[PDB]
Amino acid sequence: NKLFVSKEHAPYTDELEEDVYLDPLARVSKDKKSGSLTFNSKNIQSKD
Amino acid sequence: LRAAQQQWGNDFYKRDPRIAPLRGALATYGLTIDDLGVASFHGTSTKANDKNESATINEMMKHLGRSEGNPVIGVFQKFLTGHPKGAAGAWMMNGAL
Amino acid sequence: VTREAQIKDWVENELEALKLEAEEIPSEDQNEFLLERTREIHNEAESQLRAAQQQWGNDFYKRDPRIAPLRGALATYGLTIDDLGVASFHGTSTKAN
Amino acid sequence: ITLFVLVSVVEAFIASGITDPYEMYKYVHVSEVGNCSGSGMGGVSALRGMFKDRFKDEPVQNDILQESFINTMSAWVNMLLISSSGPIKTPVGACAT
Amino acid sequence: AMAATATDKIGRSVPAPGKGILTTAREHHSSVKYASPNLNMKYRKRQL
């Protein structure tokens, strides 16, 4: 009875929300610790 | 011909990630970020909405490389007409025109 | 395919122009310039190819008044009017509807 | 109605194979995922609350109006599952919505 | 010239506003050492 999994948090933190909004190429990655898909500062506004 | 004009005159920035939608819309007509001289704010006269909207416009202006000392002049129309629950953006559009 | 031929000709023209510009610019900051301009040219070439594909594959019928929206939508994928074999009716169970 | 919509969105993503809605953000920007669904009448339960239960002074939550909007279902979908900052366009079409 | 809509993020407040429409200014600045020719109007008219 857990088909609906409410997200407790957005994929970006409050401090990184603006950066994610302003970067069109920002994409989520799997966090090694939490294991969930989240935005990473290293991946935001990166030449890669 | 219209496809070429769309590609080079209207939608030249849809594909480019280095051009924002706002900057591209301005530059379609030769304007720049600094040419966006007026901002019809929602201006609901509430704490959260006004602070959030001012922050949003400020962040747009920062990221789009607006010249320092060139603030957008904010127009708050709901001080006079109040806040309708959906005619608001239409009244602000009329005022902007 | 004619449009793709023209697009590749345009791409190699712009590449030779970029090569001349790279010859002009000092070699100190040549790598970043080349990377930025190569990405820009790749984006432009992709945009042009998708524009041609939209013109001849997707929106070939938007301009033609002899092709209905329905017939054109069917013919985009090689189908015909007769290939519309099923109609999910509103079917409200009311006389007028 | 909002519960039905949440279940339908989750099941639709399951049918799409997207078990984690954030998997979309590996491929598109948060601004590139929209929700354009809507209702003909919206939260009629919340409308009945605000119009009748409040008139009768029965216990009604102070946010029954935000629960009554037609776009509230899409808002709850986005802010329980999607987190997208993409286009949101809630239509009303009665039976054709 | 432009018209766009946006949502904010995952939360539990319908009337809470957010920075969702900040995406209308989303831009990538990892490599902006040189101006894009695509943003120059003379270049675009040449292509046209």
Side-chain angles (χ1 to χ4, degrees), chain A residues 1-46, chain B, chain C residues 1-22 25-27 30-31 33-43 45-97, chain D residues 1-94 96-97, chain E:
Chain A
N1 292 286
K2 60 191 284 293
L3 285 167
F4 175 90
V5 183
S6 185
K7 302 290 194 176
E8 313 314 325
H9 313 286
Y12 38 76
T13 36
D14 297 330
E15 52 266 14
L16 231 51
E17 169 178 0
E18 283 175 35
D19 268 279
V20 167
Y21 290 174
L22 295 168
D23 186 10
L25 305 179
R27 303 289 182 269
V28 303
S29 59
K30 168 163 214 207
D31 208 351
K32 51 163 59 53
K33 297 174 185 298
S34 66
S36 55
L37 300 175
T38 53
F39 281 102
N40 196 14
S41 325
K42 267 118 163 173
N43 268 120
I44 293 158
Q45 295 285 356
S46 61
Chain B
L1 176 43
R2 311 250 182 171
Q5 285 181 331
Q6 179 178 348
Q7 141 84 39
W8 297 117
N10 299 88
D11 304 52
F12 66 93
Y13 64 93
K14 263 73 198 205
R15 292 246 142 233
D16 192 356
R18 277 161 56 200
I19 303 161
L22 215 164
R23 191 196 297 280
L26 267 282
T28 295
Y29 310 99
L31 300 175
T32 61
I33 171 65
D34 293 282
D35 285 308
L36 179 60
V38 161
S40 196
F41 280 75
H42 203 210
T44 54
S45 191
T46 78
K47 307 169 210 303
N49 180 275
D50 287 4
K51 198 213 184 305
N52 178 85
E53 185 169 12
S54 302
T56 318
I57 297 294
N58 209 75
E59 256 304 339
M60 299 195 207
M61 274 331 105
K62 276 218 295 298
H63 192 72
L64 298 171
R66 183 153 190 161
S67 299
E68 259 205 335
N70 188 20
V72 74
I73 304 166
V75 173
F76 305 86
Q77 188 178 68
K78 301 189 172 47
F79 93 98
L80 184 70
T81 64
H83 183 6
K85 296 74 50 169
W91 292 355
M92 307 168 18
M93 167 54 84
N94 295 10
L97 297 154
Chain C
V1 295
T2 52
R3 270 305 290 121
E4 304 182 302
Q6 292 177 331
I7 287 158
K8 69 167 219 73
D9 299 331
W10 172 83
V11 162
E12 56 83 15
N13 290 359
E14 287 286 336
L15 283 167
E16 96 195 355
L18 174 56
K19 185 190 76 172
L20 298 182
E21 289 187 35
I25 194 172
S27 179
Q30 220 172 12
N31 190 274
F33 175 73
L34 264 285
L35 291 172
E36 291 180 3
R37 297 294 304 276
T38 309
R39 188 64 145 76
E40 198 72 12
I41 289 194
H42 185 269
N43 285 20
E46 185 179 1
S47 154
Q48 222 159 334
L49 176 42
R50 314 264 191 152
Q53 285 181 331
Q54 179 178 349
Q55 144 81 36
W56 297 116
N58 299 88
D59 304 55
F60 66 93
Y61 64 93
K62 262 71 205 211
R63 287 241 143 234
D64 191 357
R66 277 153 74 200
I67 304 162
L70 216 166
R71 191 196 297 280
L74 267 282
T76 295
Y77 310 98
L79 301 176
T80 62
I81 171 66
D82 294 281
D83 293 323
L84 178 60
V86 161
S88 197
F89 280 75
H90 203 30
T92 54
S93 189
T94 78
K95 308 169 209 302
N97 180 276
Chain D
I1 179 164
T2 304
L3 300 171
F4 307 157
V5 173
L6 290 163
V7 171
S8 302
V9 168
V10 165
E11 294 226 272
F13 275 107
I14 292 157
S16 193
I18 297 162
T19 87
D20 186 5
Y22 296 168
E23 183 173 3
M24 298 184 301
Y25 305 141
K26 296 206 293 173
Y27 310 91
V28 304
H29 197 235
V30 293
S31 76
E32 268 152 20
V33 181
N35 180 5
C36 294
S37 62
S39 184
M41 296 138 84
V44 288
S45 297
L47 292 173
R48 174 258 294 162
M50 104 178 54
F51 281 108
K52 249 168 61 51
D53 303 359
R54 200 77 77 179
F55 178 56
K56 282 187 278 186
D57 208 351
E58 301 167 16
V60 182
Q61 65 191 61
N62 297 332
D63 38 314
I64 203 73
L65 188 265
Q66 54 142 289
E67 295 303 336
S68 76
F69 295 149
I70 284 162
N71 60 282
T72 279
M73 290 87 252
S74 309
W76 275 118
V77 165
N78 164 74
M79 86 185 143
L80 288 167
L81 298 167
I82 318 306
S83 195
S84 62
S85 53
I88 185 93
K89 288 174 176 177
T90 316
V92 194
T97 189
Chain E
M2 194 222 69
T5 52
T7 58
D8 307 332
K9 62 187 181 187
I10 278 177
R12 299 291 183 277
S13 182
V14 171
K19 296 269 191 303
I21 204 66
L22 183 54
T23 57
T24 64
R26 68 187 172 272
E27 215 173 6
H28 193 70
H29 299 145
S30 64
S31 304
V32 287
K33 203 181 193 308
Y34 301 93
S36 52
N38 186 58
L39 200 63
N40 181 272
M41 206 174 239
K42 300 190 177 63
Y43 176 74
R44 298 207 307 272
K45 192 67 174 296
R46 256 172 291 172
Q47 320 306 272
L48 191 80

